[PDB]
Amino acid sequence: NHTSKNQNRKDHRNGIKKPKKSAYTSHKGMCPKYLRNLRRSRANDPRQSLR
Amino acid sequence: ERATEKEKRAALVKDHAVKSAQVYARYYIDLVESEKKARENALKNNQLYVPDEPKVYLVVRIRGIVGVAPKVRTILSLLRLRQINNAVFMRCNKATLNALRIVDHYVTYGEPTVETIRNLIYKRGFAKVNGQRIPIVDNNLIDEQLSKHNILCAEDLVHEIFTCGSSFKEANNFLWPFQLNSAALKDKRNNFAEGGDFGYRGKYINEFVARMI
Amino acid sequence: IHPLPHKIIIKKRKNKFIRFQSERFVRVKPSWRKPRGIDSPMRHQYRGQRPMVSIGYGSDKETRFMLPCGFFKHRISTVHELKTLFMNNKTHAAQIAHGVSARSRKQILEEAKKMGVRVLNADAKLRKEE
Amino acid sequence: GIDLKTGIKKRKVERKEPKSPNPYIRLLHNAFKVVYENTGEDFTKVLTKRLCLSKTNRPVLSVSRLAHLMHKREDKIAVVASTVTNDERLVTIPRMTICALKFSATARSRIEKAGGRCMSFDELLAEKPTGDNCVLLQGRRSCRAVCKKFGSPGRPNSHVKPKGEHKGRRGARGRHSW
Amino acid sequence: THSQGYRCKTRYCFARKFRRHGMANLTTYNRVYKLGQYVNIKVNGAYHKGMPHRYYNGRTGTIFNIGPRALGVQIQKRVRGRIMLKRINVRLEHVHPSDCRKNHLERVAANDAARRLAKETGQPVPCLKRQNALPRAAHVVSIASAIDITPLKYDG
Amino acid sequence: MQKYIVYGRRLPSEKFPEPEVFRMTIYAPNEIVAKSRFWYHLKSLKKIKRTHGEILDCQHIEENGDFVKNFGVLLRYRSRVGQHNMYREVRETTSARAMDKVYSEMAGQCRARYHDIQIINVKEVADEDVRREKVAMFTQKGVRFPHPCPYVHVKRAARTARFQDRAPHV
RNA sequence: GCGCGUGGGCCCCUCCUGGUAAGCAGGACGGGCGAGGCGGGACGAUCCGGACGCCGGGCCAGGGUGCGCCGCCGGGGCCCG
Numbered sequence: 001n002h003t004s005k006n007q008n009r010k011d012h013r014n015g016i017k018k019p020k021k022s023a024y025t026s027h028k029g030m031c032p033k034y035l036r037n038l039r040r041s042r043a044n045d046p047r048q049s050l051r
Numbered sequence: 052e053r054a055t056e057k058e059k060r061a062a063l064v065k066d067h068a069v070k071s072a073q074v075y076a077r078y079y080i081d082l083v084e085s086e087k088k089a090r091e092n093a094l095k096n097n098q099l100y101v102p103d104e105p106k107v108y109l110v111v112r113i114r115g116i117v118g119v120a121p122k123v124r125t126i127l128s129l130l131r132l133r134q135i136n137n138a139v140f141m142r143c144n145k146a147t148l149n150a151l152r153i154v155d156h157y158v159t160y161g162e163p164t165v166e167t168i169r170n171l172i173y174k175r176g177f178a179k180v181n182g183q184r185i186p187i188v189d190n191n192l193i194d195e196q197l198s199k200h201n202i203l204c205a206e207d208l209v210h211e212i213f214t215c216g217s218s219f220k221e222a223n224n225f226l227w228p229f230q231l232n233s234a235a236l237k238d239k240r241n242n243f244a245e246g247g248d249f250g251y252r253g254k255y256i257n258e259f260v261a262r263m264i
Numbered sequence: 265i266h267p268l269p270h271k272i273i274i275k276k277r278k279n280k281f282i283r284f285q286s287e288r289f290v291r292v293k294p295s296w297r298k299p300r301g302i303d304s305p306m307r308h309q310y311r312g313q314r315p316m317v318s319i320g321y322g323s324d325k326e327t328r329f330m331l332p333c334g335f336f337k338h339r340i341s342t343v344h345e346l347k348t349l350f351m352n353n354k355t356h357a358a359q360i361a362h363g364v365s366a367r368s369r370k371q372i373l374e375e376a377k378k379m380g381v382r383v384l385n386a387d388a389k390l391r392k393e394e
Numbered sequence: 395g396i397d398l399k400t401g402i403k404k405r406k407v408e409r410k411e412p413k414s415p416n417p418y419i420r421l422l423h424n425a426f427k428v429v430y431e432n433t434g435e436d437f438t439k440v441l442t443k444r445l446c447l448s449k450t451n452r453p454v455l456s457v458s459r460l461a462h463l464m465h466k467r468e469d470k471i472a473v474v475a476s477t478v479t480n481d482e483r484l485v486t487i488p489r490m491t492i493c494a495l496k497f498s499a500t501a502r503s504r505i506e507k508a509g510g511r512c513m514s515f516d517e518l519l520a521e522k523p524t525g526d527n528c529v530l531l532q533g534r535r536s537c538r539a540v541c542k543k544f545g546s547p548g549r550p551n552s553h554v555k556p557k558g559e560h561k562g563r564r565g566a567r568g569r570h571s572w
Numbered sequence: 573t574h575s576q577g578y579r580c581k582t583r584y585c586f587a588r589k590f591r592r593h594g595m596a597n598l599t600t601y602n603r604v605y606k607l608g609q610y611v612n613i614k615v616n617g618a619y620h621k622g623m624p625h626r627y628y629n630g631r632t633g634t635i636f637n638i639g640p641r642a643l644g645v646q647i648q649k650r651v652r653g654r655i656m657l658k659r660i661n662v663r664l665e666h667v668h669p670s671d672c673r674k675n676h677l678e679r680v681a682a683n684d685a686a687r688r689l690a691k692e693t694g695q696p697v698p699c700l701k702r703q704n705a706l707p708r709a710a711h712v713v714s715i716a717s718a719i720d721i722t723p724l725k726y727d728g
Numbered sequence: 729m730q731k732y733i734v735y736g737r738r739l740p741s742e743k744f745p746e747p748e749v750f751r752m753t754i755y756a757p758n759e760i761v762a763k764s765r766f767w768y769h770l771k772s773l774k775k776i777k778r779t780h781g782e783i784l785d786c787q788h789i790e791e792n793g794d795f796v797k798n799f800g801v802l803l804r805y806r807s808r809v810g811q812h813n814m815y816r817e818v819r820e821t822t823s824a825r826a827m828d829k830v831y832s833e834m835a836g837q838c839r840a841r842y843h844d845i846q847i848i849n850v851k852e853v854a855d856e857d858v859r860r861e862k863v864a865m866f867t868q869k870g871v872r873f874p875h876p877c878p879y880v881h882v883k884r885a886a887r888t889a890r891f892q893d894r895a896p897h898v
Numbered sequence: 899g900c901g902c903g904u905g906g907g908c909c910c911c912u913c914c915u916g917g918u919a920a921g922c923a924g925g926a927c928g929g930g931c932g933a934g935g936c937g938g939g940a941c942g943a944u945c946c947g948g949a950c951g952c953c954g955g956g957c958c959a960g961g962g963u964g965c966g967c968c969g970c971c972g973g974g975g976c977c978c979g
Binding site for chain 2: 703704705706707708709710711712713714715716
């Protein structure tokens with residue numbers, strides 16, 4: 001009953017989809033200390049988006 | 052305005068063809084003369100002159116599209132052979148030579164003579180323009196696409212493809228894979244080495260292609 | 265009365281496609297129906313089966329809809345209609361409609377002769393008067 | 395037979411013409427297509443496509459957004475393929491030249507009360523088929539609630555609200571719930 | 573397969589080498605790993621804590637995060653049709669630096685540096701395109717000292 | 729079938745900056761088979777694969793056919809039993825022609841194809857040196873035998889639509 | 899984005915487990931049939947070729963060429979298929 005024949009042909013029908021650009025550069029799982037300091041550096045001089 | 056460009060361009064291309072027909076004709080003669088002379092000189096010095104290994108090959112697909120494993124399908128697609136009795140010009144690089152071994156059962160290849168190049172381009176040769184198959188009936192439509200490559204005429208084309216010259220890639224892509232008549236094929240399942248027809252045939256690809264062109 | 269010259273009319277298939285097993289049963293009328301069986305010899309298209317309807321059998325566009333006389337056909341049921349049909353028309357002919365009575369057909373034919381539009385069925389329903 | 399199923403990636407489908415019964419929209423599309431067939435200006439091709447799109451892909455742009463977007467350039471003529479709508483929040487409205495497919499009557503009144511003409515695409519073809527001094531603008535396409543419900547609400551990386559009442563605790567309160 | 577624990581089928585891969593048993597060399601801890609650098613993850617059996625799973629062994633990836641005791645590595649894993657980034661936290665011992673991009677860095681240095689060296693001397697730009705082997709040239713070879721060869725009989 | 733002599737060498741390396749040239753006499757149908765056989769022999773006898781080697785020449789040899797000379801071929805056939813050895817003796821005008829006769833008997837008598845047989849040696853034997861009776865019988869100066877196949881002359885009955893008025897005599 | 903069918907599969911290779919072993923029972927790379935006409939293999943859903951609009955030429959794959967039944971001869975060897 002168990003069988004995986006035709007699984008690879010089915011996967012390669014239009015597959016090998018890459019993960020996505022947001023995934024490669026993300027703030028997920030990163031060191032919380034790194035994230036906090038990054039926000040302070042951004043919040044000054046040109047990068048600051050604060051009004 | 053357009054009339055001047057067509058009268059001016061046509062003459063320039065026609066001059067390139069008559070002037071370089073003699074120029075290339077001597078260059079082909081030069082190749083035979085250089086090899087023949089060195090062979091004899093080497094024999095005089097008691098050495099054997101090896102000739103240069105082929106820079107270009109004529110690859111013809113001899114099997115069909117049913118039952119091809121996925122790797123073999125991809126390699127054929129890149130070689131632009133997608134149909135039986137179809138023939139393409141492919142450069143010889145370790146990449147191309149090591150890929151063609153993988154697909155040897157479905158193809159037969161060998162270095163092409165300049166009469167084979169001329170009779171393939173002239174009679175069965177077509178152009179990929181805007182992804183259309185436009186027949187090559189004149190040196191003028193060759194000029195518009197390969198104008199940057201300095202190749203301005205059909206004889207100029209045969210030289211670049213025969214010599215795997217600087218403007219080879221652009222020129223082989225410009226040539227729509229040749230669709231040829233049915234292959235003779237003594238045996239489709241065994242290599243020419245076994246007396247069949249698959250794989251390298253060397254000089255004999257000029258004889259095999261003669262009936263198909 | 266004489267058609268424009270035109271090109272040879274080539275019909276790809278002379279005989280009408282007939283539905284599978286039309287001969288075996290009266291209930292199965294000759295009208296074409298697509299072969300639909302799971303194990304239909306026709307759907308498979310095995311050797312010795314009846315031919316299958318394909319767009320390929322299509323007539324040349326210029327000859328499509330053209331009748332053997334060389335003119336095409338535009339039906340007319342009245343005289344007003346015939347003057348509209350022939351207006352600027354050297355490529356068409358008019359079959360009088362079946363419904364048109366013998367009395368009215370005389371008007372259509374007499375106008376057609378003046379108009380110059382050919383009538384395919386000019387001899388239909390001709391038996392003097394009542 | 396030829397192997398055309400290796401490096402060929404199938405045929406995509408796109409809206410070549412508007413499916414709108416409105417003959418004036420259909421006429422403008424043919425006109426902006428005819429202009430771009432002659433002069434290949436990007437603005438004219440893009441307008442032709444934006445006229446073709448569906449209501450869902452043609453979101454409204456309010457006078458407030460147009461004010462912010464054209465703040466840098468008063469001279470440039472704004473172009474919106476969707477209808478323009480009034481902002482009751484924007485008590486004072488600038489002077490703008492806008493070619494919209496339709497204007498809400500309140501917006502038309504406010505823009506013209508501020509001295510700015512409410513142009514139409516018929517006027518745009520007549521004055522600037524080229525699009526010199528013209529900016530093409532679009533409404534936030536994902537403004538519809540339908541666009542925030544799309545997805546699977548329930549998987550851990552969802553950030554999508556459940557579709558319906560719900561009113562229970564399994565999954566509703568944390569991944570550890572369930 | 574009737575059992576699927578974390579360490580199933582790991583008898584040989586998670587095993588230490590012929591003469592590598594003991595504790596990891598202090599170079600691993602001293603080594604500096606920077607953000608985005610290519611690392612290669614090979615599980616070390618001795619250091620059980622913070623071990624990667626067997627799939628992420630042999631996989632090469634980029635450091636998404638640099639933390640205290642452990643780093644975070646993203647490697648692309650193929651599941652069915654899609655290839656999805658797996659962000660994993662691995663102890664320093666399991667992760668080592670990668671020389672996968674080293675070739676490009678060597679070529680990139682020579683690419684710019686040779687071009688400048690020739691810039692002072694011969695004007696034609698040096699070709700910087702790797703050609704794949706290519707065929708053979710004229711090549712003359714002496715025959716005078718040739719050896720005749722004949723097949724030997726099946727002695728048995 | 730065509731008598732080619734091939735010259736080939738190991739690809740030049742830093743260890744072997746002048747590799748050793750090896751010559752072979754390969755009787756083959758075509759140059760492509762001849763160079764394949766040359767590489768097969770070099771692989772076993774000299775450990776050189778084609779991938780690590782270059783053939784420098786494969787020259788066709790043409791031999792005159794003025795007179796019949798006896799020729800001897802020592803070969804190592806392979807039957808389903810395993811590899812063996814065999815000496816043959818063929819009277820033919822040219823070595824390539826004699827080798828063709830050699831391959832056809834080994835096909836009929838011992839059921840071995842071209843690729844099964846390996847030719848250890850070919851040579852020209854004298855009228856004195858003949859070792860086998862068949863070559864010896866015709867080697868002698870005077871040889872008169874009645875026509876071996878007089879009946880073969882029915883090759884004409886094929887075309888005569890086979891309706892001769894009388895049944896032909898031989 | 900929006901759905902539909904499907905969720906009994908089976909063969910030919912190649913490596914298998916297992917059973918004494920099967921047109922046997924389970925696995926796997928690929929291909930095939932399923933859902934692929936057509937020619938051949940006498941006959942065979944899967945074998946060898948070829949994978950299909952409707953056609954008129956030509957070419958020719960695989961398999962063959964006494965006669966059924968389209969199409970062959972020539973040479974070397976072998977011989978109570």
